[PDB]
Design a binder for these strands. Structure first.
Ligand code: SAM
Ligand code: ZN
Ligand code: ZN
Ligand code: ZN
Lengths: 97, 228, 105, 93, 78, 101, 78, 104, 91
DNA sequence: TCGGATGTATATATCTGACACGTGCCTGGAGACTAGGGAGTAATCCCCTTGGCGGTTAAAACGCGGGGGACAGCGCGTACGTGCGTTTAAGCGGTGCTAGAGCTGTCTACGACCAATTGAGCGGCCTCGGCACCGGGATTCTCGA
DNA sequence: TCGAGAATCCCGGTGCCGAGGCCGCTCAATTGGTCGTAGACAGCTCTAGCACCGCTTAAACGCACGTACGCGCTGTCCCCCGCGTTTTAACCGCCAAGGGGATTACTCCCTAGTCTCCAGGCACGTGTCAGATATATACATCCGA
């Protein structure tokens, strides 16, 4: 009957994934997603091994840079929980949609 | 009895259009006719475009809608309550000691137009002589109204039916201002649901400076005793 | 003998390669003489300025080789290098450790 | 096969001069090469725009100095201009 | 249907790297939509460069040029 | 005396001015104090300068659009904060999300 | 103090153009600071182009080129 | 002496575009169909901008195109707002809009 | 002398809307727009010609620059009008 | 009734206004001709891309208790709205002077260009050391008492 | 106000693969000389920029008044987090076919450069209708006497 208060494991994961630098999205589902949404532009394509890695690094950096501003919007709204209106605000101030 | 209305039509001079002592009078200083954004037009039946519980920016900004200038809206609107003179049934009855107070005829709901205050428009340099001769001729009441910082509204000789209403410290009516084709016109709405047989009164907030301090006969538990 | 312009100007980055890239980069019709020397000096100063902070981070994290994590830390811990490289994603670098003050108890 | 030109050995010499005992991997060297190429293309494009705006044909050291002054922020631009001026002065005499 | 391959514990790890303490339940579909729009733009530009190059293999330099047009400037790949 | 029954509620004249300055297109900052400000902040970069008129007009037309876009994003931040009044923390949030600071 | 020339009913007029209904009292000094930082960042590049062009007058094309470097292309003065 | 623009069937000039391609130092060699193609693209874009500006001018009973009409014609289209995203048009103003949480 | 595009915008305007005019500030805005689009397409075509180790800008390079710069619906009509103009010129 | 002063405004004849048309011209665009070098095309080689299959396990998926934060409502009071008189300096004309932008000539020096040379830098092949990985023990933070 | 319990670091042994050094080989940087033209400098013109001054009047400022909303507080309920169990496909290792990217050689035809001819757009004067403006007299419209 040993349990932690909710938040401690969350801060531990924040420290762990801000210390470690590695891939977070798995390689084969991301590669299948890239190939599936690449079938809509040209049939019978061919991909290298490093292009998928470059796409995954760019997507990871874009998503982390989005969630940082989203968390800042959630803090400015006097909340801790992130709602998708914070995502919409962070993408609308930046100039995307 | 409604015969007092027919007597009052012989007392003063009733009018239907606004008159002025000069053509260049103090009006709204930015004239380019900010129009609305509603595109609805029910021209076959009844135009339900510019009504309450809607998104009429001219209604929310207190701006009259002009027929031949407001495009993409229609030809007739329910916001047009001054040029069409969509008035209320009125009956001038007697009071105890106030005089001839206007008492309501039927049930008037909240935020509903009753009757437009009309009359002459006077300049302050002429208003000084009007105050002097109306004071020395010993008239029983005063029938004036503030329009701007230097322009007033007279309704003694040439007035309307809204010049009779008395003052009370627990009112059921309020007065707004509207811009109707570069004209500043008055108007009396309703605060709450006015029932049958209730005298329609409103706050004067008069700032008098003469040699007479009148009294009030409202006798409600929110009064003071003086007039401003 | 036959000296080089890099040894003549006292620099470490090459001068003939930069002059060839200026002549073949379709920037102008004519190219001066002091421009590749000046640009090689600027590039050498920027390379030394970033490798100083990279080596300081590698010494402070008790390592020897410089990895993209130390490059990321050396760029993002400086002000003017972060202002210069503001729209640059460095691969295998990660982010800075930063926890907001309203989240931790 | 085909010779591939890179800035690896020159950044290695700068690293061995600025630190006596410090190594570097291949990925960091590729990042350094891409950084040198990016700053080279930025300064060359800004100097080309400066030479085109004034109806000139020759990119001298003045256009490179003005491009460095426009592109590098604050204190770094002053030291870059000073080191480049020292290098041009040493190359002249 | 490979957009569901971006699992729930992966967006959670991306948020923990971003610094998020608590995550609601409507974040994941919006995150998948944003990722889909961004990847469609970058893959559209990369396939445009590949079709202009008269080839069939999408190299890493096409991806670097597609990110350079967007203003990303990825270092480390060519 | 003269009765004074009318007084505008706060918000009506505000929305009227919003409609007025979203319909009109003109200069909103006075020209001579802006020119004195530009000359004073340009004295610190190079002594004894000289300006044209179209350059100062280009500076003013840039500053107008910059400040109007900043107040639009700031109003969006204040609406997201479940308020109407704009605070300077909304300005700081807009400048930090946009990437200016 | 020419920064006080940006008067109080001018920042309010900019906010009424921007669609602002109600304004606090700590907005004006922050707006003056933002305008001062932006104008310094543009005037520095304009004076740099003027010093490079061997002139002593700051033309409009230098301002257009500075705004082009800032990422804000201006039409109507070229 | 037929002009090249009359041979191409366009209204924008072609030899001026060829001279600007040879002058601006973009490449060593310039082809023959590139200024015709680029003049056609510029003519189509200019025709689209002027068509929407004429529509915005007829929407206010005016006989002359003003920069306010140009601002409205750019900002009321989806693709033209994406093309001219961070471009400031002088004497253009902004789009009239009022948020829904501000209305009483 | 001073080169501009002030008469060609007149020629396009008299074909798209005959009963209208245009001022001088709007003409300056249109000239700046034509110059900006010209410089962006020319720079994109120069980069596309440099990336393939070639020294010639062709209609394929300009078409690739148009498809990279313009959005989805507009670039298809631009490619169609340009291909029609090239076909009429080579016919 | 009589004498005297006055706003409106079209008949007649005039003063800006920013754009919309007849000519002078000269500078940039069009028509042949030649040479050569960038570009199109066929063949070859290999090496990187794609596809299949088996074993292992880290990680994804699914329930379940609960507790802490998002949301709804109420009350306080202050601070930012509207208005009025006063003050202040922004527009708006007119004149004067001049530093400095803009346009021409001379020709000196600075970079383009080609041939011979050789030291400089890219590529293949060891090689030994620094960091990857695992086991044991001491240290540090958490949470219900 | 603290002891079980779970992470977390220090230290030592194993090990393995990749940064660095060495050597051979083409090739582009270097040096020398010739030559064509880009702009540095001096000179002349003339034009907007700066400075000053008088007049007008529209915008800013200080103060009074008030009332509407920002924020503190309380309840509540619901939904996301920590933990345990079950499943499942990702990572790795391995082998096999093959298809297109890079390279080399050959051939061709497209465009830069040159010369001559000529006409088209840029200034430079004229002409607009929209928007007003100097006499003046009918049509009323009042103000003494
Ligand atoms: C309805 S009118 C005149 C009333 C009546 N018809 C008369 O002839 O006296 C408004 C006037 O009534 C007077 N009045 C207003 N409130 C009053 C009151 N409570 N008691 C007595 N007179 C009042 C005001 O002085 C105002 O001038
Ligand atoms: Zn309406
Ligand atoms: Zn209406
Ligand atoms: Zn009373």
């Amino acid at each position: 009957p040993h349990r932690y208060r909710p938040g401690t494991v969350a801060l531990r994961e924040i420290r762990r994934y801000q210390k470690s630098t590695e891939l977070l999205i798995r390689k084969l589902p991301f590669q299948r997603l890239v190939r599936e949404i690449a079938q809509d532009f040209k049939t019978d394509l061919r991909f290298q091994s490093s292009a998928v890695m470059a796409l995954q690094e760019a997507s990871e950096a874009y998503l982390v840079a989005l969630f940082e501003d989203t968390n800042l919007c959630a803090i400015h709204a006097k909340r801790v929980t992130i709602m998708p209106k914070d995502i919409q605000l962070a993408r609308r101030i930046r100039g995307e949609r | 009895e409604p015969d007092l209305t027919e007597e009052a039509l012989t007392k003063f001079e009733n009018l239907d259009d606004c008159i002025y002592a000069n053509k260049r009078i103090g009006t709204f200083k930015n004239n380019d006719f900010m129009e609305c954004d509603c595109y609805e037009e029910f021209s076959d039946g009844v135009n339900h475009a510019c009504d309450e519980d809607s998104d009429c920016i001219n209604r929310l900004t207190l701006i009259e809608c002009v027929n031949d200038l407001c495009s993409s809206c229609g030809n007739d609107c329910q916001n047009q309550r001054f040029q069409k003179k969509q008035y209320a049934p009125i009956a001038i009855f007697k009071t105890k000691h106030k005089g001839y107070g206007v008492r309501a005829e039927q049930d008037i709901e909240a935020n509903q137009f009753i009757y437009e205050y009309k009359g002459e428009v006077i300049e302050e340099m002429e208003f000084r002589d009007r105050l002097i001769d109306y004071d020395q001729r010993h008239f029983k009441h005063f029938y004036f109204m503030m329009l701007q910082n230097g322009e007033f509204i007279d309704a003694t000789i040439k007035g309307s039916l809204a010049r009779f209403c008395n003052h009370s410290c627990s009112p059921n009516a309020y007065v707004n201002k509207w811009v109707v084709k570069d004209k500043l016109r008055m108007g009396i709405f309703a605060q709450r649901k006015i029932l049958k047989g209730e005298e329609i009164t409103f706050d004067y907030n008069v700032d008098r400076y003469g040699a007479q301090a009148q009294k009030c006969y409202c006798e409600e538990p929110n009064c003071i005793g003086f007039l401003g | 003998k036959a000296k080089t312009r890099s040894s003549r100007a006292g620099l470490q980055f090459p001068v003939g390669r930069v002059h060839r890239l200026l002549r073949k980069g379709n920037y102008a019709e004519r190219v001066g003489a002091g421009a590749p020397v000046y640009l090689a000096a600027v590039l050498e100063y920027l390379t030394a300025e970033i490798l100083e902070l990279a080596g300081n981070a590698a010494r402070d994290n008790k390592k020897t080789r410089i990895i993209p994590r130390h490059l990321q830390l050396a760029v993002r811990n400086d002000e003017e290098l972060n202002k210069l490289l503001g729209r640059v994603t460095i691969a295998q670098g990660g982010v800075l450790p930063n926890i907001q003050s309203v989240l931790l108890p | 096969k085909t010779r591939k030109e890179s800035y690896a050995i020159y950044v290695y010499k700068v690293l061995k001069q600025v630190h006596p005992d410090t190594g570097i991997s291949s990925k960091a060297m590729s990042i350094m090469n891409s950084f040198v190429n990016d700053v080279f293309e930025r300064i060359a494009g800004e100097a080309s725009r400066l030479a085109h705006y004034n109806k000139r044909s020759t990119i001298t050291s003045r256009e490179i100095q003005t491009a460095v002054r426009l592109l590098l922020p604050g204190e770094l631009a002053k030291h870059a201009v000073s080191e480049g001026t020292k290098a041009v002065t040493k190359y002249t005499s | 249907d490979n957009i569901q391959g971006i699992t729930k514990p992966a967006i959670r790890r991306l948020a923990r790297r971003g610094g998020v303490k608590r995550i609601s339940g409507l974040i994941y579909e919006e995150t998948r939509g944003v990722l889909k729009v961004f990847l469609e733009n970058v893959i559209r530009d990369a396939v445009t460069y590949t079709e202009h190059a008269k080839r069939k293999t999408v190299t890493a330099m096409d991806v670097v040029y597609a990110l350079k047009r967007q203003g990303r400037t990825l270092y480390g790949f060519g």
